[PDB]
Write a protein that binds this ligand. Structure first.
Ligand SMILES: CN1CCN(c2cc(-c3ccncc3)cnn2)CC1
Length: 280
């Protein structure tokens, strides 16, 4: 699939940087014709077939195909796609209130209600994606951004669909590995992956939202990964002493090694607490 090959600078003006990653940079931008504001994600292309720098065309096309399908209040929307010899440029919905990661750092510890306010939105976005047989494969606080960080109950959107895959056969068996702290055991063990991996990541996020601590984090990536595979976590009383037993029950049903025994997204929404890269 080919994208628009006009110079993006003919149609948009760029401003402040919103994000920076291994093969991408994100710039705030403004469309000249409408005055509306977006986030332009510049993804570096591969220069050769055998190269390790940049993103393969297959991977870029996969991400764009997924983004084109999605429209939901808790997921990002894709506006347009440009390309040139060096980059594919995704013009995405602007989410200007920063990462949930940075919000959690700056704020004192969350209450269970503040945590569930966030978590219910995440669950709603993931329910949409999973209904579509889309696995995100990179859920973590850095990939959730707030629309406005200065309201009591911030609204969120899931971003960063660079690892997302359609799961039409119940699992996929590809080169898929996210951030060690957040990956499921089946990722660590290079086993076939499905929608269940996301549910593990939600359990890790939930743990962090309630405690400010990462459940599997070691001093090195390898130690983290070993901890994940062994399901080596516990609820430290220093952090969880005034956290409800039901909240812990929720996390325990997601941090399950066997993906078939893990709560699904639908189970998570009916749970009584809710119901109303890899190498150093
Ligand atoms: C781990 N990620 C990688 C780089 N970041 C981004 C940010 C955005 C974005 C989208 C809409 N409004 C603002 C920012 C899109 N893609 N990546 C954040 C941290």
């Amino acid at each position: 699939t080919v994208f628009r090959q006009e110079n993006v600078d003919d149609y948009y003006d760029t401003g402040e940087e919103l994000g920076s990653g291994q093969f991408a940079v994100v710039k705030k931008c403004r469309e000249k014709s409408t005055g509306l504001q977006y986030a332009a994600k510049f993804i570096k292309k591969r220069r050769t077939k055998s190269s390790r720098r940049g993103v393969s065309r297959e991977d870029i096309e996969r991400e764009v195909s997924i983004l084109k399908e999605i429209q939901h209040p808790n997921v990002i929307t894709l506006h347009e796609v440009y390309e040139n010899k060096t980059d594919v440029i995704l013009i995405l919905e602007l989410v200007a209130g920063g990462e949930l990661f940075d919000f959690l750092a700056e704020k004192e510890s969350l209450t269970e209600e503040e945590a569930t306010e966030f978590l219910k939105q995440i669950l709603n976005g993931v329910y949409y994606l999973h209904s579509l047989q889309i696995a995100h494969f990179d859920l973590k606080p850095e990939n959730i951004m707030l629309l406005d960080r200065n309201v009591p109950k911030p609204r969120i959107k899931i971003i960063d669909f660079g690892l997302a895959h359609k799961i039409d056969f119940g699992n996929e068996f590809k080169n898929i590995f996210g951030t060690p702290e957040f990956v499921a055991p089946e990722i660590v063990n290079y086993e076939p992956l499905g929608l269940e991996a996301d549910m593990w990541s939600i359990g890790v996020i939930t743990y962090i939202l309630l405690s400010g601590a990462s459940p599997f984090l070691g001093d090195t990536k390898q130690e983290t990964l070993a901890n994940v595979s062994a399901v080596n976590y516990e609820f430290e009383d220093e952090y969880f002493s005034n956290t409800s037993a039901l909240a812990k029950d929720f996390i325990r049903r997601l941090l399950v090694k066997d993906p078939k025994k893990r709560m699904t997204i639908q189970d998570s929404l009916q749970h009584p607490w809710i119901k109303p890269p890899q190498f150093e």
